[PDB]
C-alpha cells in the first residue's frame, strides 16, 4: 500500500490540473458571454440615444 500510494499521488496531482481546466474554462465561458451581450447593448444604446 506504500507502493499503491506513491503512484496514487501522481494520479491525484494530474486530476488537479484537469480540474483546473473544467472550472476555469466553465467560468471563463459564462462570463465572456455576458460581457459580449452587454457590449452590443452598450454600443446600441449610444445610437438609440442619438
Amino acid at each position: 500500500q506504500s507502493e499503491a500510494e506513491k503512484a496514487r499521488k501522481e494520479l491525484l496531482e494530474l486530476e488537479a490540473l484537469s480540474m483546473a481546466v473544467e472550472s476555469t474554462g466553465t467560468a471563463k465561458a459564462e462570463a465572456e458571454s455576458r460581457a459580449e451581450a452587454a457590449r452590443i447593448e452598450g454600443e446600441g444604446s449610444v445610437l438609440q440615444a442619438k
Binding site: 457590449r39 452598450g42 454600443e43 444604446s45 449610444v46 438609440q48 440615444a49 442619438k50
Partner: protein, 49 residues
C-alpha cells in the same frame, strides 16, 4: 459607453430646456408690462374721480 449616451441625452435635454425657458421668458415679461399697464391706468380713474 453608458457615459457617451448620458452625454448625448444631456446635450439634447439642455438644448430643449434652454430653448423653451428662454422663449417663455419673453412671454413672461410681456404679461408684466400689461399688468403694470392696467394697475397704473385704473389708478388714474380712481384718483381723478
Amino acid at each position: 459607453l453608458k457615459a457617451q449616451a448620458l452625454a448625448i441625452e444631456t446635450e439634447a435635454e439642455l438644448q430643449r430646456v434652454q430653448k423653451v425657458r428662454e422663449l417663455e421668458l419673453v412671454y413672461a415679461r410681456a404679461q408684466l408690462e400689461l399688468e403694470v399697464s392696467k394697475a397704473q391706468q385704473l389708478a388714474e380713474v380712481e384718483v381723478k374721480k
